Design a protein around this ligand. Structure first.
Ligand SMILES: [Mg+2]
Ligand SMILES: [Mg+2]
Length: 230
């Protein structure tokens, strides 16, 4: 037995993405616990210079709304969808006290969240951003961590948002491409090595008529890793 990595898809945004669906994926933000109305996936992405720019409008509402992109994930060549993987999304993100924004990078199975990596700045009076990781969906969701990122260290700029699975260990990272190191949270989740995945969604909402943060998405890929072969 030997092993290799198997890339399922790669979006570089040099051209309009193919093999994806717009505004029809799965979101994780538990609006029903926050006094908000249902999350909305709407609007376009603009592409320039190998970068996707999600578009939102300042429209007064009680919900998060922005564009999403989704795709399907087949089993690896060894016939497993419960195996190890890495899901990597490069972003450039910046904020300011008056700005509000959120992104989710989600892995799903049969229409439900399995893992959700979020970054958000949810107040128009503070420039604090928060990195969170959630496992499971809806009433079963468990927010594994809520990390208030110190702004002196987590400056505006380039990051790799990563979800990795290594058996029962689920890791979320926010790698600081510009300055080194970054955010890292790993949890050993009971039975997670038996839980499959079959899809992904990336969602980039703003809230109501609040001014948006600066966000762009430069690369996306998912790979099955440590895939047995003979
Ligand atoms: Mg690119
Ligand atoms: Mg703010």
């Amino acid at each position: 037995v030997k092993q290799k990595s198997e890339r399922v898809y790669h979006l570089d945004f040099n051209q309009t993405p193919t093999g994806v669906t717009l505004n029809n994926g799965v979101t994780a933000f538990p609006y029903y616990e926050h006094g908000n109305d249902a999350n909305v996936q709407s609007g376009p992405f603009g592409y320039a210079n190998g970068i996707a720019y999600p578009s939102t409008e300042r429209t007064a509402s009680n919900y998060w709304n922005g564009p999403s992109m989704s795709g399907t994930i087949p089993k690896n060549s060894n016939g497993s969808n419960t195996a190890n993987f890495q899901f990597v999304n490069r972003v450039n993100v910046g904020t300011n006290a008056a700005e509000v924004g959120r992104f989710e990078f989600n892995l799903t199975y049969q229409g439900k969240i399995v893992a959700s990596l979020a970054l958000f700045d949810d107040s128009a009076s503070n420039d604090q951003w928060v990195f969170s990781g959630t496992v499971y969906d809806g009433s079963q969701a468990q927010m594994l961590f809520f990390d208030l990122l110190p702004r002196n260290y987590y400056r505006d700029g380039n990051y790799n948002a990563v979800i990795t699975k290594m058996g029962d260990q689920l890791t979320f990272r926010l790698d600081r491409i510009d300055l080194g190191d970054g955010g890292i949270e790993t949890r050993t989740v009971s039975g997670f090595s038996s839980v499959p995945i079959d899809g992904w969604t990336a969602w980039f909402p703003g809230f109501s008529d609040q001014r948006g943060w600066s966000i762009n998405w430069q690369d996306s890929y998912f790979e099955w890793i440590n895939v047995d072969y003979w």
